Amino acid sequence: AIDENKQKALAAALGQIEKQFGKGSIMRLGEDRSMDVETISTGSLSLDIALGAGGLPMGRIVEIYGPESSGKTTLTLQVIAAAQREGKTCAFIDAEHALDPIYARKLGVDIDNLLCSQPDTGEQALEICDALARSGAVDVIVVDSVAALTPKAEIEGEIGDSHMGLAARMMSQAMRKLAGNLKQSNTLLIFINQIRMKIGVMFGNPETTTGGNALKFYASVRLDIRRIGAVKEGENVVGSETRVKVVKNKIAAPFKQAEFQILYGEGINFYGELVDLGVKEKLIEKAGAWYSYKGEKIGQGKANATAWLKDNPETAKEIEKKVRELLLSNPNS
Amino acid sequence: SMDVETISTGSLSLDIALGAGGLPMGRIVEIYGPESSGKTTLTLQVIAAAQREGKTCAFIDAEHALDPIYARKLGVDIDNLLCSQPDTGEQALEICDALARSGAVDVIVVDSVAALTPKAEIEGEIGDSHMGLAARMMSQAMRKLAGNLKQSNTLLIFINQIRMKIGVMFGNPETTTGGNALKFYASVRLDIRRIGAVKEGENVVGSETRVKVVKNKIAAPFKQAEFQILYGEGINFYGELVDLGVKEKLIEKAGAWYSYKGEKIGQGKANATAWLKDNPETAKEIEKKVRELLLSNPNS
Ligand SMILES: Nc1ncnc2c1ncn2[C@@H]1O[C@H](COP(=O)(O)OP(=O)(O)OP(O)(O)=S)[C@@H](O)[C@H]1O
Numbered sequence: 001a002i003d004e005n006k007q008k009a010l011a012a013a014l015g016q017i018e019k020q021f022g023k024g025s026i027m028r029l030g031e032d033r034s035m036d037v038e039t040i041s042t043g044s045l046s047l048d049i050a051l052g053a054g055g056l057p058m059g060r061i062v063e064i065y066g067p068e069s070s071g072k073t074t075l076t077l078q079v080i081a082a083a084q085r086e087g088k089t090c091a092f093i094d095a096e097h098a099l100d101p102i103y104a105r106k107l108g109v110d111i112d113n114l115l116c117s118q119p120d121t122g123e124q125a126l127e128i129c130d131a132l133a134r135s136g137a138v139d140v141i142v143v144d145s146v147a148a149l150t151p152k153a154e155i156e157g158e159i160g161d162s163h164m165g166l167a168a169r170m171m172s173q174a175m176r177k178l179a180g181n182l183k184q185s186n187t188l189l190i191f192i193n194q195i196r197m198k199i200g201v202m203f204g205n206p207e208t209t210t211g212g213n214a215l216k217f218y219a220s221v222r223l224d225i226r227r228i229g230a231v232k233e234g235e236n237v238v239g240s241e242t243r244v245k246v247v248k249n250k251i252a253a254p255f256k257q258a259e260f261q262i263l264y265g266e267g268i269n270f271y272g273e274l275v276d277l278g279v280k281e282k283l284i285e286k287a288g289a290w291y292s293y294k295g296e297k298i299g300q301g302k303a304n305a306t307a308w309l310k311d312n313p314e315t316a317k318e319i320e321k322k323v324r325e326l327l328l329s330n331p332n333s
Numbered sequence: 334s335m336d337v338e339t340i341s342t343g344s345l346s347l348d349i350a351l352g353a354g355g356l357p358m359g360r361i362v363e364i365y366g367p368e369s370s371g372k373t374t375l376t377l378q379v380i381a382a383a384q385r386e387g388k389t390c391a392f393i394d395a396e397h398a399l400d401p402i403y404a405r406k407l408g409v410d411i412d413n414l415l416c417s418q419p420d421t422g423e424q425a426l427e428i429c430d431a432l433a434r435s436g437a438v439d440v441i442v443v444d445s446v447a448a449l450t451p452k453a454e455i456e457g458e459i460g461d462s463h464m465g466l467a468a469r470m471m472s473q474a475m476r477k478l479a480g481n482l483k484q485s486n487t488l489l490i491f492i493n494q495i496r497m498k499i500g501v502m503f504g505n506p507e508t509t510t511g512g513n514a515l516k517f518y519a520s521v522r523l524d525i526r527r528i529g530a531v532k533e534g535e536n537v538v539g540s541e542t543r544v545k546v547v548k549n550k551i552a553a554p555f556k557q558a559e560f561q562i563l564y565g566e567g568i569n570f571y572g573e574l575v576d577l578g579v580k581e582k583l584i585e586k587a588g589a590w591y592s593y594k595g596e597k598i599g600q601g602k603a604n605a606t607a608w609l610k611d612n613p614e615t616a617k618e619i620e621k622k623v624r625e626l627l628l629s630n631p632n633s
Pocket residue numbers: 067068069070071072073074075100103240262264265
């Protein structure tokens with residue numbers, strides 16, 4: 001009897017809010033299909049498994065950070081290339097002023113359709129991000145280095161002058177504005193960031209990132225990338241052994257890691273991952289340094305085994321399809 | 334009307350730490366901490382525990398980062414959990430007041446006070462200065478809500494993010510966003526921190542968490558709570574039922590070996606909590622003992 005005017009006051013309050021601030025201001029979370037988690041590929045199968053939901057989330061903020069020459073730019077060009085192949089539009093804000101367009105083409109990016117900007121200030125860089133996000137016409141934005149987003153007062157001033165907290169304040173104001181717009185247009189924003197040392201530290205890690213604490217909070221995924229070794233063809237160094245740690249995840253369980261090769265000119269070695277995952281799931285048998293598929297001996301060593309999968313497109317498609325079926329938590333098709 | 338009503342936090346260790354046995358209804362609560370401390374997980378645990386008692390709940394996601402699948406995994410009934418995603422900071426607080434006035438919802442949660450951007454700052458440019466507009470907007474909202482919340486008997490939980498003060502020599506350099514109005518009006522104030530990992534040998538499957546009560550108008554403040562948040566599954570209330578059982582000398586622990594009523598239960602905490610899962614009888618009767626010994630005022 002008394003629990004019914006409860007439901008009436010609810011429906012009346014819902015009617016009041018939904019006509020004041022527009023149609024879908026309040027809903028029920030189980031019914032809201034704008035709140036579901038769509039993803040896009042990173043260009044690494046191992047990293048797609050480590051992220052749990054099978055890729056990077058659309059409508060969210062992502063941070064990639066690491067030491068120098070660890071593969072941060074290369075990893076973000078591989079996600080742009082994969083999204084372009086699925087008929088999406090992409091932008092690249094190059095605050096570092098260090099993008100080589102010929103290398104981007106070799107990694108598989110469509111250079112003629114990628115929107116590029118080299119802004120003079122951090123305010124200009126974050127105002128272009130907002131304008132592209134609100135447009136609804138751009139799916140993936142990459143900002144290359146938070147560390148190079150310098151406020152206008154610091155550009156106008158002299159070297160030595162103190163502007164303490166100014167960059168951190170600029171970033172804190174930008175996150176507030178962007179987070180809403182990005183979700184509304186279903187646009188993925190990737191911030192690359194550099195590492196700095198904190199002085200006078202006995203306890204914990206001395207490593208930190210630039211641009212303050214706001215980005216750590218607003219980010220849905222945070223990735224730590226590191227170069228853990230060289231890839232050699234005799235004495236020639238031909239690429240880099242790479243490890244990625246998922247330090248923060250809001251769409252799945254964190255603290256999983258991914259290992260892969262970056263080969264200079266080609267980018268991420270896809271078939272190299274396909275072997276290592278095939279070996280792990282008992283689809284490829286390893287007899288010391290002899291790889292074999294269904295008894296049929298494919299090669300001697302990982303490089304020859306990878307070279308074999310390259311000249312057998314049908315056999316590689318078969319193994320990919322199974323590894324995908326097995327290790328993907330919730331395959332959506 | 335001024336007699337206090339409480340609802341469970343989901344964690345038993347935190348229910349003892351507050352003293353009254355939960356968060357007070359018709360009041361304002363603040364829950365701050367660093368990155369990935371378990372602020373959202375704790376407030377979805379409250380909503381879950383509340384809507385199991387036949388209550389309606391709302392979630393105002395200003396952060397734009399709520400996963401409905403994870404909410405269901407923690408035990409939130411998402412089919413009748415009200416969710417809003419406001420564009421401005423003013424919309425978020427007008428929806429909070431409109432829901433409070435109606436007298437229909439019992440619990441409201443505003444995720445990130447840091448993300449409540451004033452209208453003027455949104456249609457402005459990045460670089461433009463709006464000194465204290467967030468603090469005024471919050472100060473206006475608090476004096477308008479405090480009265481409307483009490484007569485409705487509606488709980489409002491604000492989640493806050495930590496920022497750092499520049500050129501401070503004294504005290505702690507940590508701050509909270511959205512002014513010092515919320516600091517005054519807030520009845521309870523929790524400070525969550527991740528203090529370690531929970532492993533399956535090497536595989537990291539959880540977070541060792543510590544909650545501190547820095548303010549309490551309802552009971553004695555400056556008490557602690559320690560517990561485990563597992564990634565999916567949610568809060569580990571069996572893991573607490575052992576830790577409080579051994580603290581009151583109902584359970585015994587001899588190194589890595591557990592024993593209750595003479596007969597041993599398992600080796601380590603993971604096997605000890607796994608046996609409590611398989612024995613609802615002892616898990617019922619130990620809950621009985623821990624509650625009736627450490628309850629401040631038994632309602633009925
Ligand atoms: N244009 C190129 N031609 C050949 N190799 C390249 C080229 N650009 C980058 N690489 C290599 O690819 C590996 C990863 O480079 P990046 O992706 O540029 O890493 P990064 O972390 O962005 O480094 P920064 O911005 O310079 S600190 C490095 O060993 C580079 O030398």
